[PDB]
Amino acid sequence: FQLLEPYNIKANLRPYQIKGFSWMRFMNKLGFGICLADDMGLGKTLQTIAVFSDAKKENELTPSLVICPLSVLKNWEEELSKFAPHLRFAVFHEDRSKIKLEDYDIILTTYAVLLRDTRLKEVEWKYIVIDEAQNIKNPQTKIFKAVKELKSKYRIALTGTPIENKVDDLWSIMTFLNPGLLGSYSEFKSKFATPIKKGDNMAKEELKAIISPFILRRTKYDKAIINDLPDKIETNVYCNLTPEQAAMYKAEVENLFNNIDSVTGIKRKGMILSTLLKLKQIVDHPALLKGGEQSVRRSGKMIRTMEIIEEALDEGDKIAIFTQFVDMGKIIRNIIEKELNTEVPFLYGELSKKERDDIISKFQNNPSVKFIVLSVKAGFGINLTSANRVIHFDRWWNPDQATDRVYRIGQTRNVIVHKLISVGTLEEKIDQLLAFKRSLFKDIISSGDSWITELSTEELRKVIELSV
DNA sequence: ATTGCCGAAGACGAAAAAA
DNA sequence: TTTTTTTCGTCTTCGGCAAT
Known part of the structure; x- marks a missing residue:
C-alpha cells in the first residue's frame, strides 16, 4: 500500500x-x-x-x-x-x-x-x-x-x-x-x-x-474526519421543471418579449421585474400563482427537497429551509408535515419577537422537531446553531458568510448547505454570471437584481428564457 | 409474521403529432 | 427533412389484501 x-x-x-x-x-x-x-x-x-x-x-x-x-x-x-x-x-x-x-x-x-x-x-x-x-x-x-x-x-x-x-x-x-x-x-x-x-x-x-x-x-462524525471537513459544505442541487411549470415559464417568458419592445425607460425595468418575479415563483411551485392542490409532484424543487430530507433524516440531522416567499414558506411546511407526518415550525417576519424565539427554542430543544422553515430577508436575530443541514429553496439572499453569521450557521457544528437551482431556468444562467466573475461581476450585482433590468433585450433573452 | 398477486404511481425515454 | 410539444410505454417500487 x-x-x-x-x-x-x-x-x-x-x-x-x-x-x-x-x-x-x-x-x-x-x-x-x-x-x-x-x-x-x-x-x-x-x-x-x-x-x-x-x-x-x-x-x-x-x-x-x-x-x-x-x-x-x-x-x-x-x-x-x-x-x-x-x-x-x-x-x-x-x-x-x-x-x-x-x-x-x-x-x-x-x-x-x-x-x-x-x-x-x-x-x-x-x-x-x-x-x-x-x-x-x-x-x-x-x-x-x-x-x-x-x-x-x-x-x-x-x-x-x-x-x-x-x-x-x-x-x-x-x-x-x-x-x-x-x-x-x-x-x-x-x-x-x-x-x-x-x-x-x-x-x-x-x-x-x-x-x-x-x-x-x-x-461525517468519524473522529478521524469531523475536524478536517470544512464547517460549511455547499453543493448545488439541480432541479427539473414539471411539464406544468415549464408551460407557465415558457408562457411568461414569451410574453415579456412581446411587450418589452413596446416600452422603455422606467416601465421597461418594472415590466422585466414582475415578469422576473412571476418566474421566480413558477420555479418554486405553481400553486403560488394558480392556487390549487399544494402537491410535491407539481414542483421540481419539492421533488428534490424531499429526496434530500430523506437522506438528512437518515442521520438525525436538523434541517433548515430558507425561502424568499412567505407563501412558499407555508406550502413547504405543509407538504413536509403531511408527508413525513412530523412537526414543522415556520418562522417569518410578521411573527412577534416572542413568537420567533418560541420557535427557535422548539427547534434546538425538542428531540422530535427535526425541521424548521424560514421566510425572512437578512437583519434579525435567528439562532440556528442546531442546524447541520441547510436548504436554500430559492435564491433569497442579497448577493454570504456574513449572511450565514447573521444566523449562527457554521458556528457550532459542521453543516451541509444544499442550494437548489432549476436547470435551464434563469436560476442556472444567473450563476453562469456570478461564477462568470467576481472582479467585474459582483459590484453592481449587489444592487439587488436591478442590474438585470438594464441588460439588453437580446442578452436578457438568453438569460431568462428557458434553455434545454 | 411471511409471500405474492394486483393496482397505482412515479420516473424517463422514445415514439407520435403538429401552430 | 427540421423542430418542438404531447402523448405513449416500459420498468420498477410500494401500498394494500388475501392466503399460508
Missing part, C-alpha cells in the same frame, strides 16, 4: 480523500472491485476523479464509463471539468448518435440509457463507476442484468448508505464488483440472508468478513 499523490487534480484533497482515493486505486491495480461508501458530504465524486486522473497517467483510463442518476448528471459534468480540466469527457444522453465513444477518456450515462443502448453494452472499458449503486439492489431488476453484462478492467461502486447492514442490497453491488465472491443470489440468500435475517451472528460475522475488505466507509 502507499498514499498516491493527487495527479493534476485542480483542488486540495483532505487527508481522508487522499487515503480513500489511494486505497481505491491500490485495489484496482491489484485487480479488485471496491465500493466507496462515505457519507454524501465527504466527496466521493472528487476522490473518484483523483482515481481517474491517476489511472490516466498510468494509461489505464481511456475509455471509462460512469453510470449515474439523472439527478446528478451535471454534477459530474461540473466536477469533472473543474477538478480535472485535463480529462476529456462526453455526456451520453441525447443525440447519442453524434457521439463516438472511444474518442473520450470518460463517458457519463444514465441507468435509464443503459437499458436502451447497445453501443455501451459492447465496449472494452478500463473503468466503470456505478454512482449511487443502490440502483442495483434487486438483481431481479433489468438494470442489474444490463450492468453485469458490461466489460470492465476496473470497477467502483459508489453509495451513500451503509451496505454492511442491508443484507439484501449487498449481493448485487458486491457481485458486480467481484463476480462470485458470494455465489448466486439464490445460494447467497440461503447461507447468509434468511440465516442472518432469522437472527444469526455466525452468519453476519462471516459474511461481513468476506466483504469488509472491499467496502470502505467513513461517516
Whole structure:
C-alpha cells in the first residue's frame, strides 16, 4: 500500500480523500472491485476523479464509463471539468448518435440509457463507476442484468448508505464488483440472508468478513474526519421543471418579449421585474400563482427537497429551509408535515419577537422537531446553531458568510448547505454570471437584481428564457 | 409474521403529432 | 427533412389484501 499523490487534480484533497482515493486505486491495480461508501458530504465524486486522473497517467483510463442518476448528471459534468480540466469527457444522453465513444477518456450515462443502448453494452472499458449503486439492489431488476453484462478492467461502486447492514442490497453491488465472491443470489440468500435475517451472528460475522475488505466507509462524525471537513459544505442541487411549470415559464417568458419592445425607460425595468418575479415563483411551485392542490409532484424543487430530507433524516440531522416567499414558506411546511407526518415550525417576519424565539427554542430543544422553515430577508436575530443541514429553496439572499453569521450557521457544528437551482431556468444562467466573475461581476450585482433590468433585450433573452 | 398477486404511481425515454 | 410539444410505454417500487 502507499498514499498516491493527487495527479493534476485542480483542488486540495483532505487527508481522508487522499487515503480513500489511494486505497481505491491500490485495489484496482491489484485487480479488485471496491465500493466507496462515505457519507454524501465527504466527496466521493472528487476522490473518484483523483482515481481517474491517476489511472490516466498510468494509461489505464481511456475509455471509462460512469453510470449515474439523472439527478446528478451535471454534477459530474461540473466536477469533472473543474477538478480535472485535463480529462476529456462526453455526456451520453441525447443525440447519442453524434457521439463516438472511444474518442473520450470518460463517458457519463444514465441507468435509464443503459437499458436502451447497445453501443455501451459492447465496449472494452478500463473503468466503470456505478454512482449511487443502490440502483442495483434487486438483481431481479433489468438494470442489474444490463450492468453485469458490461466489460470492465476496473470497477467502483459508489453509495451513500451503509451496505454492511442491508443484507439484501449487498449481493448485487458486491457481485458486480467481484463476480462470485458470494455465489448466486439464490445460494447467497440461503447461507447468509434468511440465516442472518432469522437472527444469526455466525452468519453476519462471516459474511461481513468476506466483504469488509472491499467496502470502505467513513461517516461525517468519524473522529478521524469531523475536524478536517470544512464547517460549511455547499453543493448545488439541480432541479427539473414539471411539464406544468415549464408551460407557465415558457408562457411568461414569451410574453415579456412581446411587450418589452413596446416600452422603455422606467416601465421597461418594472415590466422585466414582475415578469422576473412571476418566474421566480413558477420555479418554486405553481400553486403560488394558480392556487390549487399544494402537491410535491407539481414542483421540481419539492421533488428534490424531499429526496434530500430523506437522506438528512437518515442521520438525525436538523434541517433548515430558507425561502424568499412567505407563501412558499407555508406550502413547504405543509407538504413536509403531511408527508413525513412530523412537526414543522415556520418562522417569518410578521411573527412577534416572542413568537420567533418560541420557535427557535422548539427547534434546538425538542428531540422530535427535526425541521424548521424560514421566510425572512437578512437583519434579525435567528439562532440556528442546531442546524447541520441547510436548504436554500430559492435564491433569497442579497448577493454570504456574513449572511450565514447573521444566523449562527457554521458556528457550532459542521453543516451541509444544499442550494437548489432549476436547470435551464434563469436560476442556472444567473450563476453562469456570478461564477462568470467576481472582479467585474459582483459590484453592481449587489444592487439587488436591478442590474438585470438594464441588460439588453437580446442578452436578457438568453438569460431568462428557458434553455434545454 | 411471511409471500405474492394486483393496482397505482412515479420516473424517463422514445415514439407520435403538429401552430 | 427540421423542430418542438404531447402523448405513449416500459420498468420498477410500494401500498394494500388475501392466503399460508
